[PDB]
Structures are given as structure tokens and as C-alpha cells.
Ligand binder design. Structure first.
Ligand SMILES: Nc1ncnc2c1ncn2[C@@H]1O[C@H](COP(=O)(O)OP(=O)(O)OP(=O)(O)O)[C@@H](O)[C@H]1O
Ligand SMILES: Nc1ncnc2c1ncn2[C@@H]1O[C@H](COP(=O)(O)OP(=O)(O)OP(=O)(O)O)[C@@H](O)[C@H]1O
Ligand SMILES: [Mg+2]
Ligand SMILES: [Mg+2]
Lengths: 73, 73
């Protein structure tokens, strides 16, 4: 149940072998995340600062509770 | 005549003020670049390794001679 990383379509854009497991292609932890109840302005600021399009949302134990993408904005 | 950086539309996606100069938004040097006469396989490998979409091509003196994008592939 641990958030070990994130896999986006920039990671698997040119992977010819589509039977490859996720663990060989994903981006490993630590990731850029936000706390629960993060406002939209703070999430957008994080996305602009780190120049990523995704932002996982985790609780106090570091367990995944949500995800914010640039698609929302 | 020096390559001081690169500006892509991920850098200027949420810039409300379009009168801002490039110098305040660009990604400053050093960049991930390739030498002249780089093959397609080497450029694609660099793009996959650094997870970027653009690769400036410079000469021995470090001056810009070309540009490769993921659009080509
Ligand atoms: N929150 C995050 N923390 C760390 N790395 C991340 C995070 N979100 C994405 N990445 C990584 O950053 C890279 C690009 O992220 P992003 O999600 O912006 O790309 P993308 O949506 O796949 O891009 P494109 O739309 O151009 O194909 C990928 O390697 C991805 O794994
Ligand atoms: N060769 C490079 N060296 C260093 N940084 C780079 C290079 N090319 C691009 N970047 C930077 O990496 C970030 C994303 O690069 P990229 O060109 O993949 O994004 P983009 O094409 O704008 O993305 P999207 O398609 O998701 O809108 C930007 O901050 C950009 O300035
Ligand atoms: Mg994008
Ligand atoms: Mg893209």
C-alpha cells in the first residue's frame, strides 16, 4: 500500500515492448507531493515551480489519498 | 551570440502577463545538448534518458548550430 512512484506517458512514449512491467519504467520515489486539503493555488504553484503536470496528495503517513493533474486547471 | 537557455511552452503555460521578457521565464544554461552530426538514435536516447523533448545541437565552441525535437521522431 505504499506510493512507490508515478508512471506517465512521457515515461512510456517510446517503449516498444508493451509487456514490460511498470516497475522498470516508472519514476521512483521520492516524488513532489502535497498534503491533504491543499488549495488549488498552492497546487498550481507547485506544478509551476517543479515544472511537472502531476501532484500526488498524501496523508500524514505518506499514504496516497489523491492526485491533481494540470487537466483540472 | 551565446546559447543562454531554452524557452518552451511548459515554461510559459500559466504566465498571465504576456509582456514579460524571455529572460525571466527561460530555463537558463547549462542545458542538455548534443554535438554536430549526432545520429537519430543518439538524440532519441538522450531525450529518453533526460526525459525532455528538445535537444540543442552545438559545435566544438559551444555555439548553437541546430535543434532536435520529439516532433521529428
Ligand atoms: N509529482 C511528480 N514528482 C516527480 N516526478 C514527476 C511527477 N509527476 C511527473 N513526474 C515525472 O516527470 C516527467 C514528466 O512529467 P509530466 O507528468 O509533466 O509529463 P507528461 O504528462 O507525461 O508529458 P507530455 O504531456 O509532454 O507527454 C516524467 O518522467 C514523470 O514521471
Ligand atoms: N535540452 C533541455 N535541457 C534542459 N532543460 C530542457 C531542455 N529542453 C527542455 N527543457 C526544459 O524542460 C521542461 C520541459 O521540457 P519539454 O520541452 O519536454 O516540455 P514541453 O514540450 O513544453 O512540454 P508539454 O508538451 O508537456 O507542454 C521545460 O522547463 C523546458 O524549459
Ligand atoms: Mg503536457
Ligand atoms: Mg509533450
Amino acid at each position: 500500500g505504499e506510493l512507490v512512484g508515478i508512471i506517465t506517458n512521457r515515461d512510456m512514449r517510446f517503449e516498444v515492448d508493451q509487456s514490460k512491467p511498470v516497475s522498470e519504467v516508472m519514476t521512483k520515489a521520492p516524488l513532489i507531493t502535497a498534503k491533504e486539503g491543499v488549495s488549488a493555488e498552492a497546487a498550481l504553484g507547485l506544478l509551476r515551480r517543479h515544472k511537472i503536470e502531476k501532484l500526488p496528495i498524501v496523508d500524514g503517513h505518506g499514504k496516497l489519498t489523491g492526485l491533481i493533474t494540470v487537466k483540472d486547471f
